[PDB]
Amino acid sequence: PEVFAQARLRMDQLTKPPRALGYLEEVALRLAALQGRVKPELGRGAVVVAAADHGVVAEGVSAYPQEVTRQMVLNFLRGGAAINQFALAADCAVYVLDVGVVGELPDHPGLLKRKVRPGTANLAQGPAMTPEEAERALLAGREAARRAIAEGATLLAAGDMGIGNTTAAAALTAALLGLPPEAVVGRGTGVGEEGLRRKRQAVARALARLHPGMGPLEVAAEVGGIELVAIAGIYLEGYEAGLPLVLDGFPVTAGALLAWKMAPGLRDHLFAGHLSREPGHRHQLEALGLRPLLDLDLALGEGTGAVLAMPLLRAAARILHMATFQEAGVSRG
Template sequence: MGYQEVLQAAKQRMERLTKPPSSLGHLEEVAVRLAAIQGRLKPELGPGAVVVAAADHGVVVEGVSAYPQEVTYQMVLNFLRGGAAINQLAQAADCRVYVLDVGVKGELPDHPQLLRRKVRPGTGNLARERAMSLDEAERALLAGQEAARLAITQGATVLAAGDMGIGNTTAAAALTAALLDLPSDAVVGRGTGIGEEGLRRKREAVARALSRLRPGMEPLAVAAEVGGLELLAIAGMYLEGYRQGLPLVLDGFPVSAGALLAYRLEPRLKDYLFAGHRSREPGHRYILEALGLRPLLDLDLALGEGTGAVLAMPLLRASARILHMATFAEAGVSDRT
């Protein structure tokens, strides 16, 4: 049976389980979608994987971030040493962490969790020039696909992306505004905690980037003009995860911007997406609305790294188990009259 057929069969089974109708709320919708993705009425989720895509951004020279650019490199080292939030949360959620260097400035040390696929050491300044060439965008997309294949080959049954890149909420805002035809003011937030002057500069940078776009540009060309290398890699991860039939969990704003690009490249991917949480970044809400997704968590998170997605993985596993419940007939329990 195909996706829609299994979805309908799972909904029918859900109605016969030993519980009042809809008593498990949104988790019931998650459960039947997982069944449809896996093509079986009793879905099972095992280990997860989060691929943290890392890259630098030339736009930081515009004063759009509260942190200096070298923090990208330093935080990648922290990921590899196991000292970051994503490492701790992933350990609690039965999720393996991978790190993908697709554009970090500086050479990183060898590490078994590091996939080296540097396209270039950071993007151009999107406020004043094209972020990357179309060829570089395609290479970043392919790097993400390769990272997803590696994670799946090594046992991942549910896949999430994470992000690391000082300045990347600026790129995410520009990409989101471009793909959803929104003004810069609607999608630009405070990111790492910038003040009013930094927010003004960030809005101006995004507005300048959007002014270079031409009507009718293809999504990949738009991403090359205003996006980030890690955002392209994230899109590639989700495209590959969809092709291999895995549930795909979104994190916050930059990751969701990458997923939005993946959706524009492959609309059928939307059926495989789950929103891990709702970020406090304003642009995130527009992406979730465009994808028709309801967040599993709403905890005022704004860290990134894949943390919100990983926190949602135990909920996905719990949702999958719902369809393993007995029906009224199987349990010999009287149904409603």
């Protein structure tokens, strides 16, 4: 691992005071170690937005009708969503993966139709999905990332779209980290005390069907969402492909937690794009041991926070491309 050492040695000789580029110096080094290069290279990015509906909307956990998921997917394909706008500004390709949206979707170049089932079952009253479906969701996730990678992605983010997925995310997070509902439940798409109560209860109901020994994917099948599992697959594929992986918000990071529990060293490839407003996000980042690159009080999802951070990751990658004191003829003191 001479590269880790060499990159670190070069960093110390770049033309700038020691520690002058703060947290970006650490990012630069991680990117260096990931690619096995002293001077990391980054270009075209990609985000795979996984969409699926949740049966838990029946418990009244969202402020939006279930139909918003399907409608937003069409919005993604037509470029009218936030993720479309940010991806345009960040040189990021946009892929949309349907793994569980309720309703049919027409064929479209930017859409991978892999519907595992019309939304999950109500997670508050039983397993969200079966083990076989969870495996298909994971497979669909890996497939989409694979395509994004084959098409030139150098940085990979995952995005989410699923009305009521903050509940599934909280349950999956509480389960994988051994946390109580109160620690992982938040505002979501904008809910008051009545909503929060109903979410905490749904999470509690799910956690009560779990037991020690259950593997991470079995836990995800019981308490999560189809798109959350697909997201875990997106990161698993990217990790195996050795690419830098960028985290978005609470629902997306919940999927990253699953991937991590299934692949221990995957955290080495993760970069937290931001810290969302969702209270549970802090817990996820603390367990992943990651510092958010951005904190803009975002609460949208879709992979927006991850995509907004891509430019920063590219800037960090360029740090080691700077001249050293000797290379630039600059006195060091």
